[PDB]
Amino acid sequence: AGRFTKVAAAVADSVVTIESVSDQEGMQGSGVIVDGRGYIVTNNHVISEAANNPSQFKTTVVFNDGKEVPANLVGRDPKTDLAVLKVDNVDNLTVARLGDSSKVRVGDEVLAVGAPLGLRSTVTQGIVSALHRPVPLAEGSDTDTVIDAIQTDASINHGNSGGPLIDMDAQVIGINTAGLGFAIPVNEMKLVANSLIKDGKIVHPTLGISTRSVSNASGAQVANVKAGSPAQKGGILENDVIVKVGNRAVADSDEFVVAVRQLAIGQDAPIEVVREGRHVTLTVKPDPDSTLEH
Amino acid sequence: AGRFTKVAAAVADSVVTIESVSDQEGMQGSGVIVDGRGYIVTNNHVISEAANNPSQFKTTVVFNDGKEVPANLVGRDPKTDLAVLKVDNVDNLTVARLGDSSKVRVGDEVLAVGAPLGLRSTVTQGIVSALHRPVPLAEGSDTDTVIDAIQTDASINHGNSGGPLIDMDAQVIGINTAGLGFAIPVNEMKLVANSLIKDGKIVHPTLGISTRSVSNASGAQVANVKAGSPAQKGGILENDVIVKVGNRAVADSDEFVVAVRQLAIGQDAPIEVVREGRHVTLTVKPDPDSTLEH
Amino acid sequence: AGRFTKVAAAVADSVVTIESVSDQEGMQGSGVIVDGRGYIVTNNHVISEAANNPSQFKTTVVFNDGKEVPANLVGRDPKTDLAVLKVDNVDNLTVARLGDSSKVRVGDEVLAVGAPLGLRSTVTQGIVSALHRPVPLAEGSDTDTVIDAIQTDASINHGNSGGPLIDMDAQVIGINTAGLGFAIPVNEMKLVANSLIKDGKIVHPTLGISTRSVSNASGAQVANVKAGSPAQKGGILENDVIVKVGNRAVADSDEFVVAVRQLAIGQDAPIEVVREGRHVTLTVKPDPDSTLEH
Numbered sequence A, B, C: 001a002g003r004f005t006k007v008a009a010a011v012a013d014s015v016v017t018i019e020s021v022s023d024q025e026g027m028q029g030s031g032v033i034v035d036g037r038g039y040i041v042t043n044n045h046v047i048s049e050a051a052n053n054p055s056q057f058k059t060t061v062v063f064n065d066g067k068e069v070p071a072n073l074v075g076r077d078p079k080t081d082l083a084v085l086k087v088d089n090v091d092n093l094t095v096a097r098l099g100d101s102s103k104v105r106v107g108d109e110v111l112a113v114g115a116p117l118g119l120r121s122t123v124t125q126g127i128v129s130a131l132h133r134p135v136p137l138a139e140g141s142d143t144d145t146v147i148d149a150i151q152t153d154a155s156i157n158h159g160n161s162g163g164p165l166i167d168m169d170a171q172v173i174g175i176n177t178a179g180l181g182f183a184i185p186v187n188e189m190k191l192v193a194n195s196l197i198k199d200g201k202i203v204h205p206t207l208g209i210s211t212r213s214v215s216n217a218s219g220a221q222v223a224n225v226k227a228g229s230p231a232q233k234g235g236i237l238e239n240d241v242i243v244k245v246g247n248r249a250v251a252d253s254d255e256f257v258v259a260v261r262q263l264a265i266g267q268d269a270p271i272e273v274v275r276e277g278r279h280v281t282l283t284v285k286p287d288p289d290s291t292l293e294h
Helices: A003-010 A049-052 A187-198 A230-234 A255-263 B003-010 B046-054 B186-199 B230-234 B253-261 C003-010 C048-052 C188-199 C230-234 C253-261
Strands: A015-021 A028-034 A039-042 A058-062 A068-070 A072-077 A080-085 A111-114 A123-137 A147-153 A164-168 A172-177 A179-185 A209-214 A219-225 A243-244 A269-275 A278-284 B015-021 B026-035 B039-041 B058-062 B068-070 B072-079 B082-086 B109-113 B123-137 B145-151 B165-168 B170-178 B182-185 B209-214 B218-224 B241-245 B269-275 B279-285 C017-020 C027-034 C039-042 C060-061 C068-070 C072-077 C082-086 C109-113 C122-137 C145-152 C164-168 C173-175 C181-185 C209-214 C218-225 C241-245 C269-277 C278-284
Touching: A003 A111, A003 B072, A015 A039, A028 A172, A039 A187, A049 A072, A068 C164, A072 A187, A080 A187, A080 C269, A111 A172, A123 A255, A123 B123, A147 A255, A172 A187, A179 A187, A179 B072, A187 B039, A209 A243, A209 A255, A219 A255, A219 C060, A230 A278, A243 A255, A269 B241, A269 C230, A278 B279, B003 B109, B015 B039, B026 B170, B039 B186, B072 B186, B072 C230, B082 B186, B109 B170, B123 B182, B123 B253, B123 C122, B145 B170, B145 B253, B145 B269, B170 B186, B182 B186, B209 B241, B209 B253, B218 B230, B218 B253, B230 B279, C003 C109, C027 C173, C048 C072, C072 C188, C082 C188, C122 C181, C122 C253, C145 C173, C145 C253, C209 C241, C209 C253, C218 C230, C218 C253, C230 C278, C241 C253
Parallel strands: none
Antiparallel strands: A015 A028, A015 A058, A028 A039, A039 A080, A058 A068, A072 A080, A111 A123, A111 A164, A123 A147, A147 A179, A164 A172, A172 A179, A209 A219, A219 A243, A243 A269, A269 A278, B015 B026, B015 B058, B026 B039, B039 B082, B058 B068, B072 B082, B109 B123, B109 B165, B123 B145, B145 B182, B165 B170, B170 B182, B209 B218, B218 B241, B241 B269, B269 B279, C017 C027, C017 C060, C027 C039, C039 C082, C060 C068, C072 C082, C109 C122, C109 C164, C122 C145, C145 C181, C164 C173, C173 C181, C209 C218, C218 C241, C241 C269, C269 C278
């Protein structure tokens, strides 16, 4: 057996098809069995329409064996493009073995595994091209987001979106997201899913800032400040060039969005800014984007 | 020597350039020496224009050594995008070693080898991403078709189209077709070529049905039924959702076309249909698409 | 450590980021430390705008450690898309180990390495798909060119353009150029850079000929002959189909441009032509495209 063939076969049992059907729409993606009690992680855009119209759509899981099982949405996060599904009382589940995406290195050989029984599913091979790479993700009603992705030259497409990005120990180091390829790191998936399973929601910090990238005074230039926002109270203004959020240098508006989310909610943080040519440090206390889930 | 370098060099002698030239057009593709008597398999779209205008076009083979030889069309099949050429009385031919595409597995490392002396030929590397994958192929006068392809993330382009998809034992498991990459499986190539060499034609079954895909009652929905067709006599109607042809579940119009061709010609077969919401099984006897070659 | 991970880490110290910033523009690419005295080779389009507007742009190198250093343009060649930069009095430089691109073979495994600290840098993996492959390159004020590239199915993009194409001995066999992927061979880079370091310019031969490709009397068909050119004095005319320049058969206008540059400047050379259907050989003495640098 080939060296990638063994790795793809060993994890095929842990990968499932995810299907959302209505009266005149049937939607598919891949997923990953992360808990033996029937918890399956996919990405939020695979199930986005069903979660936004739950009265008309129906979600099912098709396992490697062909077994079709009803599935229920535990929670979802458009901001990380993640989601958790639950299948109830399904036995002998092969739980995916989850790696540590902080031990992933550029050049590591990876497989982007799709649902073994999906309609036009794919299994692609490549290497890790970039780590901690901010990428904007576009969906339906949800709003666009940015994530620190693992980048890979393994192709990420409709046929493996939501499936796992696998290392050569058959461990999950990421969740593929097709909507030059990108994966959500597994350590971020572990956090987001640990809170979607418990709370059915994840709470991210906000500052009320919309930026545009600038490079010449490079960084994320403030396009608008929400009234009453933590940036209102911190003293951040328009035309400001944000160059550091917390302990993270901000290269552009993509790294800004990701640097805000690595801040502590409700805890003072420094924001370094170049204003009219003058280096100004500012203090901000991030709000929870969901006040009543916090 | 590298592990892919050895494999690509060992099969370079079995790959040829195929050139079709006229007064104001010169066309190229790759090909594969499959028989020591001078039989060369390419795909039908490489030679499509020359076969449709044989009075104005001229086809030649350029071997790995540089030898140019005249070539004559034995037969071709737009339905599988395959074709056979013949070079006469050329000695010391290195015949490609042909594999068994039913022993191919997802994750298998492959090379998509192009003509070693072609104009802008390529040799690409990847894995098998999907097996038994129906793909529509678009040509000139010929009509579009669908095939169960091997899917690969090795790039399939103009520079290796018609060349072999090679496994790590230097065996041909497929024929590359550029007109995310797809190859005709070798076991299907062996069948189609075994009949093009003998008969100069291949005969495929037909039912007289044109479908469109539906997914919500998913399958291939009948758009039109030819009068007097086997579907006329079987009782298949319009707005019917074909969900199984023979022993093969039909996911969409792509899998329909491929499932019809795996039927026995002139032998009763069951067609399962969802009509106005009612599961109706129907019997059909497939016609030969070429009555006087059958 | 993975087999590509070790190779990418071992050369990460020899790869740098190259940044050209002005008042309202900031430009990035990758580069390669080729000499311990501070010589860095990139491709010409990374620095094209800064070299054409040196009063407004500022170029810097960011090393693997994070050290930012000012950089000065030693020379550049839009015709090979190459360029040399110099950092002065920077110590403990890890000099890239340079391979021999004439010992590169189709199927060789390669890494297209980008700047380890670049904005959206990539490291991609693949094989050598084609050797001695003429490719047109498009820039700003510079004029388009054609080069004998190494072709690779490793992705060549903005994030590794200007960085090295690396073999499995961690040796540079090419310079990546994003503006299916292509690299300038290292042996051609060695020549062009050896003359840009000494002379701050490279001198290429010219004949005063503009061609268009023809294939039916295939080759490079003469579209225009410059008055007083070496082609004026050699007797080359319009509508001529150039089929060989020197010791190199010319398949099209791409191979023509590359075959002219492999001629000796100021030394008689044969040009084989098909004129009105008649094979005519002609003699030409190539001019230096830069008379006062020659």
